[PDB]
Ligand binder design. Structure first.
Ligand SMILES: Nc1ncnc2c1ncn2[C@@H]1O[C@H](COP(=O)(O)OP(=O)(O)O)[C@@H](O)[C@H]1O
Ligand SMILES: [Mg+2]
Length: 1361
């Protein structure tokens, strides 16, 4: 069942991107190499935002750049057909493949018509062209270049979204190789039908993104950035798109090249089509289920059943329109491959996986203070570099008038003085825009607070004289404070009149004048509103004399037109007639009001629109614009009451809703500014950080239950903005519906695709649309799509309006192609509101009633009685949809089936061991002792290692290839393919490599392979450092004091560090092994050391996330061994002390701690049980504690969610075998029968192949000594255990660790264990290589170590002695 299989495989392939077989980037000949890509990443990192814009954004905007036809012509093939249709350009060219010539289809976005902006008929032409090439078995090269598909009134009237939803449906289901190549810009839903290819490439200077970079300006205004900053933060370069896995490589060609690089475009196409065809043949070799899918699709062409045959007639889709034009078996392979690549381009995580931010050192109401500080920061930056007064002739001529009239004999002085400051305050009001109110308050406060040595300061010479320098002088200072105070009241007056513009519009429609009382009372109310929302000392009478002075300036109309130009960005909801009457009120009716103050007969109030412009149909456009403002107001009242939520939508019709994967959420690997704060805020409110809620519900159809799928949009997160986690939840729901045979109902509301998830979010349009296309075409069950609230962007432009679904809308739904954030200017309710679109053909199967908004249909009939009304109910549509289906006999109910190892835990007689070295020798020895056959996997140096020699004829050895870890053990797909091939009973994930990764645990358990260790839930809870601390806090276990969540920035790190007291630690969340652990001594150091250690974490792991802990200088590293079964018996075996360590790596490890009180030992035993039971832990695990020697306290640090190398020390002293107990637990057995003891004492020395050598100051260090071992004797002794890979004639490899043996001594007491281990280390012989043993012998003959008085920093001090 290929529909179920493609989500399984694509989930597997997205768990480890680098070593997946979805990497076809090696195949294509003519791409740039990974070295040039790494070098280009270093340049783009070191450049600023302007250098990034020049490199990336400016060449795709270039009007001199070769078009789609010119690029296709310079492939130098033979053109067979062309179809130029506006900004669409389809073609068909024969290319030479060396063996012969071949027809290759083309569909391109042509930049030399409409800039590549596609219209509805261009999408319908792309639909047709994609079938036409499929019917003729022609491979297709898509060429992407667009500002996005048109969001205009004509597009949405022609049903733009419904043409794109079909175009994506054809592209996703085409039966020929599809290659995408970005030849310019790939923005939004116009780029995704073409970018939905098998292999998506880009030219060297191309771009691919969620929307055009100027559309990010709305999100830039909300968080106080520029749109250029938001564009770099999103990461839109071809190099960054290749790093995120959005594209499959960068072709070494730009459209203007005429050297060797012009030949790379045809070569990249030839090798791409050949690569997809070789890959698709390899998929038909290995997939026997691809035959079954093809035979099921063939059987529908043989016998077209009436319910799907009627859907194919109405939908017009790419089907077998002939037996000759019926697709081949490889045709279904291109659909399959295309889904796997689209679905591994999208990526999401879970709530347990996401690392929580620090609540510690965060002020109350912080958001407004941080935005105030950003507005002050940009204001202080203007105080540090203000503009010169020579730059504008209008301001320059007023300075000349001012200085001339200042020496002249007092009226002309006062006129020129006031006029200079006035035009400076309008100039800064044009400049500062949406933040102008805040920056004028800060300018007033600045001017009042200025030193007398700056207020009395005489002006610089004209060339160095700035607009700041002009107004800071005392003579211009306090009148400019007055200008700024009146401009604040004007900005409030203007914005209050804009929000009250409907009252003006009504009276203009019904009398053609705005009466004198209506302009008086609107002016009164707007000044009273301005001076009651602002406590400013400048009163109504002073502002009235300024308003007369302003209405006495000759450039007053020009000041209103300049203002209106930048205000049009913030108010894209008003039409031309509404902007004209707004301007006419300020320009003419306010002067006419003053002129008629002396004599009221001079007032007429008459709006003459011709004096602002000869706009046709002015009063009928004013009628439409007023009706649309009332529709906007009604939909804002509906948002503010908040009746259409996911809970309320469910309670109106459905009962016992069971959500599928409610924990799925945004990955956020671009880390967009303020978006992680929004994920935190959502989580603290209990809201899903995901644009969709999905589940299965009961619907009582005439008292009797019917089980249906239910997908309701989450208007509680980002107004229902659809996301990569929403796409995975939709695929999961359609899979549960395909398994159980459920009808699907959907309620969809969205602001569009989540732009703050990167360019990767776009692929969700094609992923979810393909799963709905395949769901109806393989499983027949009806999908309903009730568009509600605002239903816009890519959710609207794909799956909601898809031609096989029954599309519905609630009354009052806003349904355009894109929303207010992206739309440049006003769109009529005739082209946006679902009421007027109800009778427009193909827009919907019906407009239904909104069951929450009581009076809506009468409120809409009072706005326009000729508006089309709703007819059907949501209950009527659902009962008619359910009753016309065949009622198949329902199976007995199953739960939502998830990854559970406990089901897979069956008796083990053959096991895969994922390990090398001493860990593999230990696990191979335990496999013999438990009577289990080993399937061993190994690198080329390790095929002839001692763990391979320890195997029998009944045990297997398999070659992974290569020398290093990357070429062998870290390839998870090779290791899983061996587990599947040998049919292994379980897989032991070893130690090191992928042992502690919950992704590698999930990868095995997806494919039904038993993972020997904890559940994936237990691994993510105690593997995520913030959540491990939060679970410890919940179980009354003291943690190592710190931030407790993850730090945001250097200011956060300073404040949490100050509260703990310096010195302190900075640690990486994805760290471990002592990597990136920086000590910070001071606040002076912390500012530089945070930025530094964030770069260490980002370089080492690809995540700069730091979290802070208290630096304890005198400690013991105490760690406590847990065992636990599936039944819940937390058998805690005992502790170890691993304090003799060198660069965090443990060296001399012990079964007890000589400075730890028995009361604190009992506390860490109780805390291990509390954590083990409260996470539902399984297998072997080790919780780590800092035992502060100064404080006499024990603090939880972190947990090992796997087998620990120190384990044979506790095997001796507990009397319990840790690996045998873990193999019993992973066979499904209980460990209740075990009795943990405290048998004597034990100690381990890690014997490593290292030579002594001095550092730069002369202190002795140990460093690795590789080479062939000539002699190696470990004498047989009863109270020592030897795990070893050292023997005569074996080599110690430079590609791996110097660990050559673990020597674990046992004895009665600690002095006896030390003395026996000292004597045993002298009886042990090693030759050929050097070893660490000269140091180990001296620690065992130290007096301070023999007394047991030391700390974790003992060893580097002792090596210096
Ligand atoms: N402030 C500190 N207090 C205690 N240990 C610290 C501190 N800073 C670094 N460390 C080292 O890190 C240990 C904590 O576990 P860690 O070494 O990070 O584990 P791993 O690297 O094996 O995951 C401590 O025992 C100590 O050796
Ligand atoms: Mg450690």
């Amino acid at each position: 069942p290929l529909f179920l299989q493609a989500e399984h495989l694509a989930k597997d392939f997205s768990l480890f991107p680098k070593h997946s077989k979805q990497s076809l980037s090696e195949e294509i000949k003519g791409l740039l190499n990974d070295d040039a890509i790494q070098a280009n990443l270093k340049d783009l990192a070191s450049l600023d935002v302007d250098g990034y814009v020049a490199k990336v954004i400016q060449p795709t905007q270039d009007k001199g750049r070769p078009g789609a036809k010119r690029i296709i012509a310079d492939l130098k093939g033979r053109l067979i057909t062309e179809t130029h249709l506006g900004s669409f350009y389809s073609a068909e060219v024969e290319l030479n493949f060396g063996s012969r010539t071949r027809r290759i289809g083309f569909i391109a976005q042509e930049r030399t018509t409409a800039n590549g902006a596609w219209m509805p008929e261009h999408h319908y032409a792309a639909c047709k062209a994609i079938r036409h090439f499929a019917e003729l078995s022609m491979p297709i090269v898509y060429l992407i270049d667009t500002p996005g598909a048109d969001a205009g009134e004509v597009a949405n009237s022609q049903n733009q979204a419904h043409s794109i939803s079909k175009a994506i449906a054809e592209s996703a289901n085409v039966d020929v190789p599809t290659v995408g190549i970005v030849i310019g810009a790939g923005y939004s839903g116009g780029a995704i039908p073409l970018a939905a290819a098998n292999i998506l490439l880009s030219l060297r200077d191309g771009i691919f993104n969620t929307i055009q970079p100027q559309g990010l300006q709305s999100i830039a205004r909300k968080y106080n950035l520029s749109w250029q900053e938001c564009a770099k933060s999103v990461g839109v370069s071809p190099e960054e798109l290749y790093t995120s896995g959005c594209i499959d490589g960068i072709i070494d060609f730009s459209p203007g090249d005429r050297d060797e690089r012009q030949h790379n475009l045809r070569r990249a196409i030839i090798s791409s089509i050949e690569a997809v065809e070789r890959a698709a043949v390899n998929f038909v070799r290995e997939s026997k289920d691809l035959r079954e899918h093809y035979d099921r699709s063939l059987a529908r062409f043989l016998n077209p059943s009436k319910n799907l045959m009627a859907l194919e007639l109405n939908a017009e889709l790419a089907v077998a329109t002939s037996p000759t034009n019926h697709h081949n078996l490889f045709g279904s392979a291109y659909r399959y491959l295309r889904y796997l690549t689209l679905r591994s381009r999208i990526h999401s995580i879970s709530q347990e996986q996401y690392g929580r931010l620090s609540r510690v050192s965060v002020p109350e109401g912080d958001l407004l203070a941080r935005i105030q500080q950003e507005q002050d920061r940009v204001f202080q930056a203007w105080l540090a570099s203000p503009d010169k007064l020579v730059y504008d002739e209008d301001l320059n001529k007023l300075w000349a008038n001012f200085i001339a009239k200042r020496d002249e004999i007092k009226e002309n002085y006062k006129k020129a003085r006031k006029a200079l400051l006035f035009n400076i305050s309008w100039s800064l009001y044009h400049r500062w825009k949406s933040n102008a109110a805040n920056n004028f308050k800060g300018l007033i406060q600045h001017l009042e607070n200025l030193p007398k040595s700056v207020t009395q300061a005489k002006w610089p010479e004209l060339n160095q004289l700035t607009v700041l320098d002009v107004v800071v002088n005392d003579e211009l200072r306090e009148d400019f404070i007055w200008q700024c105070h009146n401009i604040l009241i004007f900005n409030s007056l203007y914005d209050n009149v804009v929000g009250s513009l409907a009252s003006i519009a009504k009276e203009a429609m019904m009398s053609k004048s705005l009466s004198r009382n209506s302009v008086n009372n609107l002016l009164h109310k707007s000044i009273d509103h301005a001076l009651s929302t602002q406590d400013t000392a400048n009163d109504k009478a002073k502002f009235y004399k300024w308003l007369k002075y302003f209405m006495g300036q000759s450039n007053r109309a020009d000041l209103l037109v300049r203002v209106e130009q930048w205000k049009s960005v913030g108010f894209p909801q008003l039409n031309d007639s509404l902007f004209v009457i707004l301007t006419y009120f300020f320009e003419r009716l306010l002067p006419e009001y003053f002129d008629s103050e002396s004599d009221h007969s001079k007032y007429t109030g008459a709006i003459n629109p011709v004096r602002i412009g000869r706009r046709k149909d002015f009063w009928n456009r004013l009628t439409m614009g007023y009706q649309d403002l009332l529709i906007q107001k009604v939909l804002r009242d509906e948002k503010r009451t908040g009746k259409m939520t996911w809970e309320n939508v469910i309670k109106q019709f459905f009962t016992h809703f069971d959500e599928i994967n409610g924990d799925k959420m945004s990955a956020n690997l671009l880390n967009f500014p303020g978006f992680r704060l929004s994920i935190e805020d959502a989580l603290d409110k209990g809201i899903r950080p995901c644009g969709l809620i999905t589940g299965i519900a009961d619907f009582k159809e005439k008292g009797q239950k019917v089980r249906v799928g239910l997908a309701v949009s989450n208007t509680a997160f980002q107004a229902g903005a659809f996301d990569m986690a929403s796409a995975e939840k939709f695929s999961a729901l359609l899979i549960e519906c395909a398994k159980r045979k459920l009808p699907v109902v959907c309620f969809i509301s969205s602001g569009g695709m989540q732009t703050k998830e990167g360019a990767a979010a776009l692929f969700s349009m094609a992923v979810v649309n393909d799963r709905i296309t395949r769901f109806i075409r393989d499983n027949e069950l009806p999908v309903l799509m009730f568009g509600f609230g605002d239903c816009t962007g890519g959710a609207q432009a794909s799956f909601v309006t898809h031609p096989l679904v029954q599309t519905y809308y609630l009354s009052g739904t806003n349904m355009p192609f894109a929303g207010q954030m992206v739309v440049p200017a006003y769109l009529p309710s005739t082209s946006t509101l679902s009421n007027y679109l109800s009778k427009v053909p193909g827009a919907m199967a019906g407009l239904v009633h909104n069951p929450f908004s009581e009076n809506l249909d009468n409120q809409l009939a009072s706005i326009d009685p000729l508006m089309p009304m709703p007819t059907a109910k949501i209950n009527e549509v659902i009962i008619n949809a359910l009753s016309t289906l065949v009622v198949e006999a329902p199976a007995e109910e199953e739960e939502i089936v998830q990854n559970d190892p406990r089901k897979l835990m069956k008796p083990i007689n053959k096991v895969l061991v994922h390990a090398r070295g001493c860990t593999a020798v230990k696990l191979i020895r335990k496999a013999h002792d438990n009577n289990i056959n080993v399937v061993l996997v190994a690198s080329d140096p390790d095929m002839t290692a001692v763990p391979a020699d320890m195997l029998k004829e009944s045990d297997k050895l398999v070659c992974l290839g290569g020398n290093t870890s990357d070429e062998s053990y870290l390839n998870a797909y090779s290791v899983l393919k061996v587990a599947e091939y040998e049919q292994v009973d379980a897989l032991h994930p070893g130690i090191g490599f992928l042992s502690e990764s919950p992704q590698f645990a999930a990868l095995c358990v997806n494919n039904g392979v038993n993972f020997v260790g904890p559940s994936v839930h237990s691994m993510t809870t105690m593997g995520n450092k913030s959540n491990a601390i939060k679970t410890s806090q919940a179980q009354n276990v003291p943690v190592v004091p710190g931030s407790h969540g993850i730090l945001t920035n250097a200011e956060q790190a300073v404040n949490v560090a100050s509260e703990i007291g310096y010195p302190v630690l900075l640690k990486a969340v994805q760290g471990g092994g002592g990597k990136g652990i920086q000590v910070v001594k001071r606040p002076e150091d912390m500012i530089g050391l945070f930025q530094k250690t964030a770069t260490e974490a980002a370089a080492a792991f690809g995540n700069g996330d730091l979290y802070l802990e208290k630096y304890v200088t005198s400690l013991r590293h105490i760690e406590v061994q847990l065992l636990r079964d599936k039944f819940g018996h937390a058998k805690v075996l005992g502790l170890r002390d691993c304090s003799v360590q060198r660069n965090n790596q443990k060296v001399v490890e012990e079964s007890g701690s000589t400075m730890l009180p028995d009361e604190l030992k009992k506390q860490v035993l109780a805390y291990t049980r509390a954590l083990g039971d409260a996470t539902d832990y399984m297998g072997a695990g080790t919780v780590e504690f800092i035992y502060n020697l100064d404080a006499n306290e024990v603090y939880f640090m972190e947990m090992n969610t796997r087998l620990q190398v120190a384990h044979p020390v506790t095997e001796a002293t507990s009397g319990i075998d840790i690996v045998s107990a873990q193999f019993d637990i992973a066979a499904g057995r209980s460990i209740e029968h075990l009795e943990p003891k405290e048998i004597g004492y034990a100690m381990e020395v890690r014997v490593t192949a290292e030579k002594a050598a001095l550092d730069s100051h002369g202190v002795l260090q140990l460093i690795p000594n590789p080479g062939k071992i000539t002699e190696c004797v470990f004498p047989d002794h009863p109270d020592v255990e030897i795990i070893s890979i050292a023997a005569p004639g074996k080599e110690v490899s430079p590609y791996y660790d110097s660990l050559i043996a673990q020597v674990i001594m046992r004895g009665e007491n600690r002095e006896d264990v030390i003395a026996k281990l000292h004597a045993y280390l002298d009886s042990v012989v090693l030759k050929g290589i050097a070893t660490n043993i000269p140091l180990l012998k001296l620690i065992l003959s130290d007096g301070t170590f023999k007394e047991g008085v030391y700390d974790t920093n003992y060893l580097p001090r002792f090596m210096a002695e």
